[PDB]
């Protein structure tokens, strides 16, 4: 059973800058003290990301956006609202659907032909007499039908909490769809009460390499709502950006982890740094390989 709880408020998406976010490890080999150059789907530095936040002010919004080539995800978290996604192509009818979910202790991955209503949510019920809270609710899909794939593992979204103060749980994700393999990268970084993508660097670790092979064009993010304007609750804000085919140059530190990445298509200084393969450049003339224009 599902219900028309839209209460959608229309506001323009406040485009904001990520400042050198969205880079991951391109390969599964331990290098160190090297400047390996790679060409892969990466979020470009100083790129427009979409600040989506449906809360504060009964403002609820959760539109269907295009997976394009990849989807950089962030989830500055306060009270565990973002619970998963429903990647797919049509998200209804007779087509194949993906229902990436992060449960209370595990991660359930199902690629199947689910039917979806317009406003999917996960509803948690709290009782006074027994106090047990159960996820025994399913309103993202009405039912499931002629199903193909199921996967249970350790959950992606991990607390990493217990520490105090102003630090926040910034949860980063990278989704890409290549050779029918939905690759998922993630890392979690504490941030000292920042209201914007932090000024630092990220190293997104590989999590799963799912052998799915399904068409994914219009993805969407699940949320969790309590019971209690029926079925409303929480507080959340997340940020979505898209990966494009670019070229980066990564410098590896002495621990084997990346320190900083120098893009090859934003600034003339970065193009010269890319075409000379070094992170320090002196004064002079540096002929640059051509990455400025793409037809």
């Amino acid at each position, epitope marked *: 059973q599902c219900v028309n709880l839209t209460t959608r408020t229309q506001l323009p998406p406040a485009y904001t800058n990520s400042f050198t976010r969205g880079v991951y490890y391109p390969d599964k080999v331990f290098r160190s003290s090297v400047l390996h150059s790679t060409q892969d789907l990466f979020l470009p530095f100083f790129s427009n990301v979409t600040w989506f936040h449906a809360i504060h002010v009964k403002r609820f919004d959760n539109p269907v956006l295009p997976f394009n080539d990849g989807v950089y995800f962030a989830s500055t978290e306060k*009270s565990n609202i973002i619970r998963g996604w429903i990647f797919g192509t049509t998200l209804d009818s007779k087509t194949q659907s993906l229902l990436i979910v992060n449960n209370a202790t595990n991660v359930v991955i199902k690629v199947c032909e689910f039917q979806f209503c317009n406003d999917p949510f996960l509803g948690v019920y709290y009782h006074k007499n027994n*106090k047990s*809270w159960m996820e025994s609710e399913f309103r993202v899909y009405s039912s499931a039908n002629n199903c193909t794939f199921e996967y249970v593992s350790q959950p992606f979204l*991990m*607390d990493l909490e*217990g520490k*105090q103060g102003n630090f926040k749980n910034l949860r980063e994700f990278v989704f890409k769809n290549i050779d029918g393999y939905f690759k998922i990268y993630s890392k979690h970084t504490p941030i000292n009460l920042v209201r914007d993508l932090p000024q630092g660097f990220s190293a997104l670790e590989p999590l799963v390499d799912l052998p799915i092979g399904i068409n994914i064009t219009r993805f969407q993010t699940l949320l969790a709502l309590h019971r209690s304007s029926g079925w409303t609750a929480g507080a959340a804000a997340y940020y979505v950006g898209y990966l494009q085919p670019r070229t980066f140059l990564l410098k590896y530190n002495e621990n084997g982890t990346i320190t900083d990445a120098v893009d090859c298509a934003l600034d003339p200084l970065s193009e010269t740094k890319c075409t000379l393969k070094s992170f320090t450049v002196e004064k002079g003339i540096y002929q640059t390989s051509n990455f400025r224009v793409q037809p």
Partner: antibody, heavy 126, light 112 residues
Framework: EVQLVESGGGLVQPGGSLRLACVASGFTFSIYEMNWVRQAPGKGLEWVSYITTSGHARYNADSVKGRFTISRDNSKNSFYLQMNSLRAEDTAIYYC????????????????????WGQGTMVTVS | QLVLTQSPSASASLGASVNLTCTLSSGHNSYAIAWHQQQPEKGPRYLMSLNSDGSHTKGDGIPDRFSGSSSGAERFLTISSLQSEDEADYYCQTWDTGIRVFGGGTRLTVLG
């Protein structure tokens, strides 16, 4: 009703292995991570180890010399301290307590401090 | 880790007022605590998780008599109109990255 009952006492020479448990009922374990606390006789209580809701373990507090191990069987609705290598100082009460931060929470995260405590068991070791 | 300079013995008259003190290391000035009362020969009882601003989160069966206050990097628990049951051990504990702390306990020999 929330309650934390334990069992698995025993007298052994140092280096022996026993079976400690914290059975509970009346509330969800899936969304509650559990801690362990050690209280030497006449001394202050000191936590030893804990397991998270997902399944990750922390054998911290540097009093455990790689001797204590924690696990959990969510299927059987029970909580075990995977126990081996008891030593002389380990003769103490082992109050197991349930943290206030359940996984489906609101408000500020002034939680993970224990709201309830088990009755505790005395595991005498010499 | 943080150390608690809580007096091993503090006392006052019954029906009077006292103030317990939980001291905390300067490195974690804005850190919060929670108070556990360990009545002797029984289990611990949780009173309040004290915010850095003195806000309250209360356990069952504890009246408004037991209250908490904060000032600087150190913390207080307030008791007014003392009764017979106060002779017990009080433990102030904290949070970290997987590292609880707890304290020596506040054996309290309220004379009366």
């Amino acid at each position: 009703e929330v309650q934390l009952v334990e069992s698995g006492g025993g007298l052994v020479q140092p280096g022996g292995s026993l079976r400690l448990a914290c059975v509970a009922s009346g509330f969800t374990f899936s969304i509650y991570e559990m801690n362990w606390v050690r209280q030497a006789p006449g001394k202050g209580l000191e936590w030893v180890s804990y397991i998270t809701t997902s399944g990750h373990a922390r054998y911290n507090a540097d009093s455990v010399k790689g001797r204590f191990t924690i696990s959990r069987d969510n299927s059987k609705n029970s909580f075990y301290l995977q126990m081996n290598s008891l030593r002389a100082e380990d003769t103490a009460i082992y109050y197991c307590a349930r943290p206030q931060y359940h996984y489906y929470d609101t408000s500020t995260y002034h939680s993970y401090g224990f709201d309830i405590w088990g009755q505790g068991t005395m595991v005498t070791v010499s | 880790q943080l150390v608690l300079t809580q007096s091993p013995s503090a006392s006052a008259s019954l029906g009077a007022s006292v103030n317990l003190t939980c001291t905390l290391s300067s490195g974690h000035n804005s850190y919060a605590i929670a108070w556990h009362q360990q009545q002797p020969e029984k289990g611990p009882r949780y009173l309040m998780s004290l915010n850095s601003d003195g806000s309250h989160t209360k356990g069952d069966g504890i009246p408004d008599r037991f209250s908490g206050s904060s000032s600087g990097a150190e913390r207080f628990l307030t008791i007014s109109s003392l009764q017979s049951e106060d002779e017990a051990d009080y433990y102030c504990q904290t949070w970290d990255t997987g590292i609880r702390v707890f304290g020596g306990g506040t054996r309290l020999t309220v004379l009366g």
